[PDB]
């Protein structure tokens, strides 16, 4: 089914699973036209498909050419997401195929179920968790690869860098969702927190800086403080 805190390890049972976020598939800018009407212009987007246990991210880049001459684009985007996820599963060896696919938005259930009819043993499910994966585009190396693409393209990342050498995936996913929630709430301040100290750098083959254990505790504190700060600014608390 749909998931909860009433199992804080059922989403984390032992099966290969993937989280599929479609927020950033169809992206537009809205602008006035010479005649004073309004028009959209699409820009490149991406499907965020993530394994919680391993950190492997299958970033499918959605080139704007996909939309050319098509109608009802918000609806098509859900069906294109489902098609690309289904094609990813079929490309993986059987022993790497997922036992569960978990969509961050309920509107993806029917399109992904219909595309995956040939895989009756793969459960397609929603989640009550509010995951901040829409902020994936605030990660500079992912935004850069999406906006430079000139053609459809799939790019593989480990979104936890080398963290699993030192922490559990439960803790790594915790760190990731706190980082993305902060970037979603106040992008500039979150980035200021992550980069301020220039003696800590981002390895060329990483997405995040090379913090020691003690520095990550500090950085995590500053992210919790930013989120609280913004909650205060928002509600006048």
């Amino acid at each position: 089914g749909a998931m909860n805190s009433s199992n804080y390890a059922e989403l984390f049972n032992n099966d290969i699973k993937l989280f599929v976020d479609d927020t950033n598939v169809y992206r537009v800018t809205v602008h006035k036209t010479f005649e004073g009407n309004v028009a959209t212009k699409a820009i490149n987007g991406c499907i965020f498909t993530l394994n919680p246990k391993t950190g492997h991210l299958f970033l499918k880049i959605i080139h704007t050419s996909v939309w050319a001459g098509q109608k009802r684009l918000s609806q098509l985007a859900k069906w294109k997401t489902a098609e690309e996820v289904s094609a990813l599963v079929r490309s993986l060896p059987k022993e790497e195929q997922p036992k569960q696919i978990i969509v961050t938005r309920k509107a993806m259930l029917d399109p992904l179920e219909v595309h995956m009819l040939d895989f009756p043993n793969i459960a397609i499910r929603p989640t009550e968790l509010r995951l901040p994966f829409s902020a994936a585009m605030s990660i500079d190396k992912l935004s850069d690869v999406v906006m430079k693409a000139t053609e459809p393209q799939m790019v593989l990342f480990n979104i936890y860098d080398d963290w699993l050498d030192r922490i559990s995936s439960y803790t790594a996913f915790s760190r990731l969702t706190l980082l993305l929630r902060a970037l979603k709430t106040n992008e500039e301040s979150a980035k200021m927190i992550l980069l301020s100290d220039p003696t800590i750098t981002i390895k060329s083959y990483h997405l995040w800086p090379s913090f020691t254990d003690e520095q990550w505790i500090t950085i995590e504190s500053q992210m919790r403080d930013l989120i609280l700060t913004e909650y205060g600014r928002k509600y006048n608390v």
């Binding site: 029917d110 399109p111 040939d118």
Partner: protein, 300 residues
């Protein structure tokens, strides 16, 4: 005309014959129904006065044999049988008619209601949904499940309706996922009409039979099937114009005949709003929309 005599009526029971019904009292001198119009199927149905459990009954066609009813005190119900001795049957009936122990099927001559509910329903197609080959008539009751219901459990006693499932490989061509899921025309026209039913008349017959089983027996499996076959048409962008026109007539007479006091359970609010107001055929069911809005506006 034709006749369904009864040996006796030893238990009190409400007897239905098509859309008509009447009460018989315990051991009252009732010996059946006469003047039944030849040329249509019919259904004779029962609900025991002392145990409303199990509505049950019999679909039959007086052209296919001579049928009578007799109570079985072991199985506790009114059973249909076929009398093969014709001269005997005629002798029995004439005696009951001479002694006026039979009720007359009460057909008004302005009334086409039963023709309008059974236009496409054919006894040969009923007997393939209800499998009991050694009889010329078919038994149905409140509790019989459908083949589809027994997939989600004695298969000999099931209703073998054609299974309709919008999220199945049969409804969805590989490579046309979005297209076939948002527009059911492939499933309706190629899979169901050309493939399984062969023509629209057989599809509407199964539809009409599903509605009548649901309304006369309170069969949940039938109610599901009726709504599914309606939704399959309405959810298709490409339907022959003759089919849409005929569907509007079919549904109009079903809504007109539905007892108002059973509307809450016999009409699925979700399905009807979709069909009348959201679907591809939202504008193609003018007579049905009007009666639904004037008679059951609460459901909408």
């Amino acid at each position: 005309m034709n006749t369904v005599p009864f040996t006796s009526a030893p238990i009190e029971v409400t007897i239905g014959i098509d859309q008509y019904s009447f009460n018989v009292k315990e051991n009252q001198p009732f010996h059946g129904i006469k003047d039944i119009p030849i040329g249509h199927v019919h259904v004779i149905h029962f609900q025991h006065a002392d145990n409303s459990s199990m509505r049950y009954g019999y679909w039959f066609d007086c052209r296919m044999g001579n049928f009578y009813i007799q109570y079985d005190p072991k199985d506790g119900l009114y059973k249909m049988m076929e009398e093969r001795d014709g001269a005997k049957f005629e002798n029995i009936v004439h005696n009951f008619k001479e002694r006026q122990m039979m009720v007359s099927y009460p057909k008004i001559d302005e009334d086409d209601t039963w023709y309008n509910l059974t236009e496409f329903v054919q006894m040969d197609k009923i007997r393939k949904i209800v499998r009991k080959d050694e009889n010329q008539f078919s038994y149905v009751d409140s509790s019989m499940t459908t083949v589809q219901e027994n997939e989600l459990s004695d298969p000999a006693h099931s209703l073998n309706y054609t299974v309709i499932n919008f999220k199945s490989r049969e409804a969805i061509r590989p490579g046309h996922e979005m297209e076939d899921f948002l527009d059911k025309s492939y499933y309706l026209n190629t899979v169901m009409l050309q493939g399984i039913f062969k023509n629209s008349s057989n599809y509407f017959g199964e539809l009409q039979f599903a509605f009548l089983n649901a309304m006369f027996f309170g069969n949940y499996g039938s109610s599901l099937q009726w709504h599914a076959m309606i939704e399959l048409i309405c959810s298709s962008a490409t339907v022959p114009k003759h089919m849409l026109d005929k569907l509007d007539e079919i549904l109009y007479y079903q809504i007109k005949t539905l007892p108002e006091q059973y509307s809450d359970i016999l009409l699925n609010e979700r399905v009807w709003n979709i069909c009348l107001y959201s679907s591809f055929q939202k504008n193609s069911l003018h007579n049905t929309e009007k009666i639904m809005e004037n008679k059951y506006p609460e459901l909408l």
